[PDB]
N, CA and C of each residue as an Amber inpcrd file, in Angstrom:
protein
    18
  13.9250000  -0.7070000 -14.6710000  13.1680000  -0.0780000 -13.5510000
  11.6800000  -0.2310000 -13.8090000  10.9640000  -0.6150000 -12.7530000
   9.5090000  -0.5760000 -12.7430000   9.0710000  -0.0030000 -11.4060000
   8.1980000   0.9960000 -11.4650000   7.5740000   1.5820000 -10.2920000
   6.0690000   1.5680000 -10.5030000   5.3510000   1.1660000  -9.4600000
   3.9120000   1.3070000  -9.4250000   3.4840000   1.9220000  -8.1030000
   2.5080000   2.8040000  -8.2170000   1.8530000   3.4340000  -7.0860000
   0.3490000   3.3460000  -7.3250000  -0.3820000   2.8090000  -6.3390000
  -1.8500000   2.7440000  -6.4010000  -2.4560000   3.2730000  -5.1180000
């Protein structure tokens, strides 16, 4: 799993 929020 990889999550990014910017």
